[PDB]
Design a protein around this ligand. Structure first.
Ligand SMILES: [Zn+2]
Ligand SMILES: [Zn+2]
Ligand SMILES: [Zn+2]
Ligand SMILES: [Zn+2]
Ligand SMILES: [Zn+2]
Lengths: 66, 284, 87, 351, 460, 344
């Protein structure tokens, strides 16, 4: 019985890349990257990936809303 | 699946006598009664507050026991009331036991009790459209003698199978008594997806009752545990009284005759047959 | 002419503006059937009216006791009722 | 106020054996907009229901199915005691759309010859659900009706919301002069009840025909399932039946044996004929002020019976619809239900 | 829903068996197990012997065996049984405390915590003492989610909500607002909400003087049956009575007046588990007294109303001018954006609208239902049940407020040949267990239902 | 475009401009003249007056009027100052008009018989089925980085250019070419449209298309199915003799005000005497999802459903990446074309 658990993050390669850019930004918590459309991460830190993803987008977007 | 388990039990004080007669009087229906009291609480408990009910048959009539028709105008405390109201109603049936009850032993109102129940279930499924109750019933009989095959109750047995098959009802039967596979019941338990257990007299049926009579309620994925084969070589030649195989069936009467037929007016309806048709049947 | 007996039916439509004012000029038994709301109809609600008519008429509405009123059953509802009517 | 029948003039013979062959209309007129999807689609819904009903109360019978497209009638399910063949045949048809005209002369012509193999004891029957208003006859139709009435093939047809004299005539002609058989709906439920009523045998006043003694035997289920084997389908069936005379494994069916050819029945089919043949007497609605019986029902225990004097509510009616031969009360529910599923009059059974 | 069942297995084996000490709590834990698990309990409750798994495996035939794995896995996690690698085989037997406490409570046994109720003149009327309890819920719910008047006076309750973060409202500022947890409070209706709060108080009231078995015995005593007389007086522990009185104050004990009487067995204790009918100065127009408006035009047509309810409706729609029957409000992508600002996903609101606002949307839902499920294989086009047009806008709005995705399961390996992966994948779509796959990688991150069955088929 | 399909023989109907002298006072049958003629400062040859002299001279029973509101009522009040016919006919086009003076033109022609309740009548079977759709072109970092950098409206072509948007268009092109259908595209860009028309490579109507080439492509478009894609810029409205609509695509969505968007929707979606396709009037709107006009793309959707046109969204394209000419498909070239379009 083999079963390798984790946090499978599947998205577009670009957000993946961004998430991976973001994931590289807090110390490579992505355990594995299954393909261009999937990522395997430790759930302990995915929370903060989005937080900085949020901040960096909040730093980036800043929401003009024209 | 709230399943309505309604038990129908027949008590002729001549047949409960036979339950006393068989073996020794090592325990009358009370062992079966205390078995049933425990069994009724369990299925009541099993599915989602799934209701129960009880009817009986006198020697000379029938009556409801747990449904407890309008009269005024522990363990979960619903087991208690279901048991005790049943215990009180049935003891009221035993005071309705005397010589005149002992009198009308010619008939067995088993036929009437079970037709009345189908009116009751059609009545509850009609009302309980919400929470459609995956109901299913039960039969317990004290196998008594003096009538090897009382054949006066055959058509209502078979008609109600259709309604039972028509209303899609699995039907389980347990016979307590002498080893007489009630062929018509044996076909019946077979006909409408049921389980036949011809248990012996004095065994606490609780082990038996829980095993094979809980099969259906809504489940039916599990091997029914019926008794042996359910042969459908049906009623004896009405004229002969021998079970026919190549039956000889009269006419619009549809009476079953053996190789016996009188050649005229088959012995269930006044229908003369074409002597040519009789001779054609005799061309062999 | 489209009608023969009391069991007969059929539509007798009138198609002209002047028919609105000549409803009285029609014979009584025709006039009894021509009601006020049936005047000057456009062709459209004419078809809906006869549509329901043909359907309802197509039904076997035979009470056989209201026909005791309108058929005056055999030699009796005349002899019973009308020989009472000699008043 | 009551809508109940006076008297039945036919409990004596019912056509217990049948060969009913239902024919449909897949023509343009079925695409008009009166019935909810159309004529075409909602007609087919109730036919499926009737199909299930027709074989439940006359399972000894068979049926075939024919459509009516493009002035050409087209058989879609053979005359069979197997409803699923017809049911599956009906499932495909609704997916095609009705077209062309109903050429009744076509449809009548193939119906008449389809029933020639149907024997004397089996009854020939045709049920036309006509919904268009014009036909297209390949030949003389009176020739065919004359040929039809000659073959002892009664015809009852269910016109849509209209009356057509020829099917007035056809139902009149075939059904022994007794025109009772062009009954027509105004309504879906009227259509629904038009379907349910076509299930039972159809006696009006039977003429004296050869009452033929019918020789058959009864099959018995097989046990060995690893020995899954069949003589009626040549496949691995985990247990079938065995004809009493042929001795060949036959799958579960009231169908005839396929090796010695005797009708295979267990017991269940004939008892539907019994309550078909000898039904009960209708539960009389007891008079309101003259009943004075138990304030309950009999088949069930329905304490609702009145309210004891309520000016209007009590002077209305006392829910005591009681059968006669038993003289036992029955709530309308039971009285309706007793008369609905289990004939088996509860009072008349216990005595 | 936190699925409180997962909490019972989380408490270690002993406190379960400690919990299992009262045949009440034996008889209680039994009703939540999956029906396969239920069936495997009672068999080996009475026949006083363990059973090999091969029989339990042969008892369950093909598909439905997944519930056979559903049964046995929940069974072991809460340790009401003891697996036994006795001779290399599997000897299955109850945690015996369960079976006999059950068997006792089955055959009139010693569940005195179960028998802790008392029967007396049950003066609690059907209408009496639960309107306070129902109003208790109404007032505190208006307090917790934020009503026009937040009449929730449960100081112990308010601390649990803020301390447990039950609502994403500023407890420091007194805010009772719906956060991610507060949005989840708006989702779990009766069980799940009744589940969710029972968890917060246990987390809150767990530091000192817990007595969890007594807490669980006392909680299961008040909700097990109407303790009636002697419940809050006698059939209650010290911390249990404080819990019972605290449950009394929270309404979950409809503890009768005088603060010292039998367990006021409010109906609130019943609903936490019953998962059945939910309906609870001197006027209360019901049941359809509530009302709302949700139709294809995406607008509120309110004729019936309820203030906390329309306050709740206003939590995701603008209110402009409450009229005689209508409240001036119109649901838009802006209106739901009031909740998406709170991170409230357009997921629970889906189930909310299909259930809630129905008392005015009965016909509207009923006309939407049309019974288009048996007609579904017949008429392949379902007739707008349930409304799909709203959810796509919600999803597209949710998709507009989105772009983070993740999956559960476990990555799998040792798939040696293409035939087994092709055969395993083919069967997986038959039961529907595979999130994403690829023959190239021979890896996928899904549930283990695929791995358990191939092992069981290979091994037995 | 209709009156010869109509029963009318134009031999009688003297068309008048007073640059267009025609047979006044001898015109035997019905007449078709125009306002600026019939009264204006554009009362500009005595053909005009003499027609009007004839208009007064001959007694007229009925007056068919088309868009009286645009031209001042005063001249209509002057074609209502002089002649005294018997009837007029106000076939008005808007509920509220600048000729809604307190004495309305309703109370001079005949009462209202036909109004904003266009549900009784057109539903009786006149109009066919029109399908509308709105594809969400997938997001790519630069557009957002382009969205991020400027909040200005200059993002307009920056999501219009989406090469993925070109792709979905080409799918319809091969699709409607496969179906023998006809495609209208509403693209006011010049470069990215050329960039796209270059990317497609069919004889293409585009920005400032030669009307003959327009007509040539149109002839090669409606009668010839080989060219089954034309691009109508803002020069279509207003106005050309707009071509038939089976597959309308709209790229630009500012095109304000919204009263025009009712116009364009009505104007660009012309009628089609083809029933081979199940939705014989496709309306499409290729929008880069997650861009500036999601607000304004959501503004178009509410308009159409108010107009009642059958509408849908197709973002799960069948073979989205399977189409030919995946030019600029990559986010880089979308970025590269985004740099290409930042010029525009
Ligand atoms: Zn006979
Ligand atoms: Zn076979
Ligand atoms: Zn045979
Ligand atoms: Zn009754
Ligand atoms: Zn009777």
């Amino acid at each position: 019985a083999r079963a390798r658990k984790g946090a499978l993050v599947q998205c577009d390669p670009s957000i993946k890349a961004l998430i991976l850019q973001i994931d590289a930004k807090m110390s490579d918590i992505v355990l594995e990257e299954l393909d261009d459309t999937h990522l395997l991460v430790n759930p302990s830190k995915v929370e903060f990936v989005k937080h900085e993803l949020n901040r960096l987008l909040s730093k980036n977007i800043y929401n003009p809303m024209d | 699946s709230p399943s309505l388990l309604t038990v129908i039990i027949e008590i002729a004080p001549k047949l409960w006598t036979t339950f006393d007669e068989e073996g020794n009087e090592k325990g009358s229906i009370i062992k079966v009664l205390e078995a049933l009291i425990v069994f009724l609480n369990a299925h009541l408990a099993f599915n989602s507050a799934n209701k129960v009910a009880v009817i009986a048959a006198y020697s000379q009539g029938i009556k409801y026991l747990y449904p407890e028709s309008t009269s005024a105008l522990x363990x979960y405390r619903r087991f208690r009331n279901v048991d005790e109201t049943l215990v009180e109603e049935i003891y009221k049936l035993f005071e309705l036991e005397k010589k005149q009850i002992e009198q009308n032993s010619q008939r067995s109102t088993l036929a009437g009790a079970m037709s009345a129940g189908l009116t009751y279930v059609n009545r509850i499924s009609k009302e309980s459209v919400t929470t459609s109750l995956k109901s299913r019933l039960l039969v317990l009989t004290c196998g008594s003698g003096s009538s090897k095959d009382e054949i006066f109750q055959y058509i209502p047995i078979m008609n109600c199978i259709f309604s039972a098959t028509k209303m899609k009802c699995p039907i389980d039967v347990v016979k307590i008594g002498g080893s007489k596979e009630s062929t018509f019941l044996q076909q019946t338990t077979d006909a409408t997806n049921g389980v036949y257990l011809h248990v012996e007299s004095t065994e606490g049926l609780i082990q038996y009752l829980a095993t094979a009579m809980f099969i259906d309620p809504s489940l039916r994925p599990i091997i029914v545990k019926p008794n042996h084969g359910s042969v459908d070589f049906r009623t004896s030649c009405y004229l002969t009284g021998r079970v026919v195989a190549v039956g000889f069936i009269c006419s619009v009467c549809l009476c079953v005759l053996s190789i016996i037929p009188p050649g005229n007016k088959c012995p269930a309806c006044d229908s003369q047959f074409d002597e040519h048709v009789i001779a054609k049947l005799k061309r062999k | 002419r489209v009608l023969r007996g009391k069991d007969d039916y059929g539509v007798m439509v009138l198609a002209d503006r002047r028919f609105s004012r000549k409803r009285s000029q029609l014979p009584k038994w025709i006039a009894q059937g021509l009601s006020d709301a049936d005047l000057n109809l456009s062709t459209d609600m004419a078809i809906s009216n006869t549509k329901q008519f043909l359907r309802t008429m197509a039904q076997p509405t035979d009470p056989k006791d209201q026909e005791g009123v309108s058929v005056w059953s055999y030699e009796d509802l005349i002899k019973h009722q009308n020989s009472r009517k000699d008043q | 106020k009551k809508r109940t029948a006076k008297k039945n003039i036919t409990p004596y013979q019912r056509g217990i054996i049948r060969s009913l062959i239902l024919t449909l209309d897949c023509s343009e007129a079925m695409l008009e907009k009166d019935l909810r999807p159309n004529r075409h689609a909602m007609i087919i819904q109730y036919a499926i229901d009737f199909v299930h009903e027709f074989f439940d109360q006359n399972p000894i019978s068979q049926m075939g199915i024919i459509i009516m497209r493009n002035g050409l009638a087209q058989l879609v399910s053979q005359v069979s005691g197997n409803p699923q063949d017809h049911i599956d045949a009906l499932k495909s048809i609704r997916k095609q759309e009705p077209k062309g005209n109903p050429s009744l002369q076509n449809a009548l012509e193939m119906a008449r010859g389809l029933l020639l193999p149907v024997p004397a004891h089996c009854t020939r029957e045709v049920l036309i659900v006509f919904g268009s208003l014009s036909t297209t006859d390949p030949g003389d139709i009176h020739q065919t009706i004359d040929s039809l009435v000659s073959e002892k093939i009664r015809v009852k047809v269910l016109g849509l919301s209209a009356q057509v004299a020829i099917c007035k005539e056809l139902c009149k002609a075939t059904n022994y002069g007794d025109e009772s058989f062009y009954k027509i709906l105004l309504d879906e439920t009227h259509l629904k009840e038009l379907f349910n009523e076509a299930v039972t045998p159809l006696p009006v006043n039977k003429i004296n025909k050869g009452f033929t003694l019918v020789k058959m035997g009864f099959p018995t289920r097989i046990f060995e399932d690893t020995p899954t084997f069949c003589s009626c389908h040549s496949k691995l069936v985990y247990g079938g039946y065995f004809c009493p005379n042929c001795h060949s494994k036959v799958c579960s069916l009231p169908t005839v044996c396929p090796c010695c050819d005797l009708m295979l029945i267990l017991s269940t089919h004939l008892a539907r004929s019994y309550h078909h043949l000898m039904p009960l007497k209708t539960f009389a609605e007891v008079p309101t002020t003259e009943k004075f019986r138990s304030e309950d029902c009999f088949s069930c225990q329905s304490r609702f019976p009145x309210x004891x004097x309520x000016x209007x509510x009590x002077x209305x009616x006392x829910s005591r619809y009681r059968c006669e031969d038993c003289k036992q009360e029955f709530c309308v529910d039971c009285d309706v239900f007793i008369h609905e599923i289990l004939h088996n009059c509860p009072g008349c059974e216990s005595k | 829903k936190h699925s409180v069942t997962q909490y019972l297995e989380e408490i270690p084996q002993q406190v379960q068996n400690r919990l299992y000490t009262s045949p009440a709590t034996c008889l209680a834990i039994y009703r939540i197990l999956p029906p396969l698990a239920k069936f495997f309990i009672m068999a080996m409750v009475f026949n006083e012997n363990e059973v090999p798994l091969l029989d339990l495996d042969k008892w369950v035939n093909s598909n439905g065996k997944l519930q056979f794995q559903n049964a046995i896995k929940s069974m072991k996690s809460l340790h009401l049984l003891i697996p036994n690698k006795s001779s290399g085989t599997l000897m299955i037997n109850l945690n015996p405390t369960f079976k006999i406490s059950l068997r006792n409570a089955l055959t009139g046994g010693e569940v005195q915590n179960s028998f802790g109720v008392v029967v007396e003149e049950n003066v609690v009327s059907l209408d009496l003492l639960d309107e306070y309890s129902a109003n208790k819920w109404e007032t505190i719910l208006h307090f917790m989610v934020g009503t026009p008047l937040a009449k929730i006076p449960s100081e112990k309750v308010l601390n649990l909500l803020k301390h447990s973060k039950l609502m994403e409202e500023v407890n420091s500022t007194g805010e009772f607002k719906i956060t991610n947890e507060g949005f989840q409070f708006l989702l779990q209706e009766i069980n799940s909400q009744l589940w969710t709060l029972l968890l917060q108080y246990l987390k809150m009231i767990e530091t000192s003087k817990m007595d969890l078995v007594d807490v669980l015995h006392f909680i299961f005593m008040l909700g097990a049956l109407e303790v009636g007389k002697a419940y809050k007086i006698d059939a209650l522990s010290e911390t249990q009575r404080i819990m019972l009185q605290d449950m009394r104050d929270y309404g979950l004990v409809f503890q009768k007046h005088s603060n010292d009487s039998i367990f006021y067995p409010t109906k609130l204790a019943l609903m936490l588990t019953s998962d059945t009918k939910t309906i609870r100065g001197l006027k209360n127009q019901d049941i359809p007294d509530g009302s709302l408006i949700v139709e294809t035009n995406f607008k509120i047509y309110s004729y019936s109303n309820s203030p906390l309810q329309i306050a709740v409706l206003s939590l995701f729609v603008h209110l402009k001018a409450r009229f005689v029957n209508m409240v001036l409000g119109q649901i838009t992508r802006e209106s739901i954006r009031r909740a998406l600002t709170n991170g409230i996903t357009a997921d629970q609101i889906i189930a909310y609208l299909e259930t809630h606002a129905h008392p005015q949307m009965r016909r509207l839902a009923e006309e939407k239902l049309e019974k288009k499920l048996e007609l579904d294989p017949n008429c392949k086009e379902p007739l707008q049940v349930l409304p799909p047009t709203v959810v796509d806008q919600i999803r597209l709005w949710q998709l507009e407020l989105d772009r983070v995705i993740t999956y559960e399961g476990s990555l799998y390996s040792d798939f040696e040949t293409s035939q087994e992966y092709n055969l395993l994948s083919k069967y997986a779509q038959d039961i529907g267990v595979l999130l994403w796959k690829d023959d190239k990688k021979k890896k996928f991150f899904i549930s283990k239902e695929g791995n358990s069955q191939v092992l069981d088929f290979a091994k037995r | 475009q209709f009156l010869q399909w109509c029963t009318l023989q134009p031999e009688n109907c003297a068309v008048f401009t007073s640059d267009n002298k025609e047979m006044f006072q001898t015109e035997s049958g019905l007449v078709v003249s125009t306002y600026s003629m019939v009264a204006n400062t554009r009362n500009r040859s005595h053909d005009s007056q003499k027609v009007m002299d004839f208009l007064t001279g001959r007694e007229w029973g009925f007056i068919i009027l088309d868009e009286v509101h645009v031209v001042p009522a005063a001249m209509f009040r002057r074609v209502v100052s002089t002649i005294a016919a018997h009837a007029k006919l106000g076939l008005t086009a808007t509920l509220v008009r600048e000729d809604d003076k307190i004495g309305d033109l309703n109370f001079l022609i005949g009462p209202k018989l036909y109004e904003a309740n266009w549900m009784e009548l057109s539903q009786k079977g006149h109009i066919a089925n029109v399908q509308c759709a709105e594809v969400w072109c997938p997001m790519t970092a630069e557009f957002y980085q382009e969205y991020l950098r400027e909040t200005a409206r200059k993002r307009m072509l920056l999501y219009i250019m989406n090469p993925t948007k070109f792709q979905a268009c080409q799918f319809l092109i091969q699709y409607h070419e496969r179906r023998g259908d006809k495609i209208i595209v509403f693209s006011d860009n010049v470069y990215a449209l050329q960039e796209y028309a270059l990317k497609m490579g069919k004889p293409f109507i585009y920005g400032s298309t030669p009307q003959q080439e327009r007509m040539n492509i149109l002839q090669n478009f409606q009668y010839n199915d080989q060219i089954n894609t034309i691009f109508l810029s803002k020069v279509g409205d207003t106005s050309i003799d707009l071509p038939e609509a089976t597959c309308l695509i709209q790229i630009s969505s500012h095109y304000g005000s919204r009263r025009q968007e009712a116009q364009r929707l009505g104007r660009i979606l012309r009628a089609k005497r083809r029933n081979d396709e199940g939705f014989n009037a496709f309306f499409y709107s290729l929008v880069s999802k997650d861009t500036q006009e999601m607000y304004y793309s959501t503004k178009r959707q509410a308009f159409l459903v108010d107009q009642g046109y059958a509408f849908k969204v197709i973002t799960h394209l069948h073979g989205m990446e399977n189409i030919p000419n995946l030019a600029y498909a990559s986010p880089r070239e979308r970025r590269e074309l985004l740099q290409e379009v930042l010029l525009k």
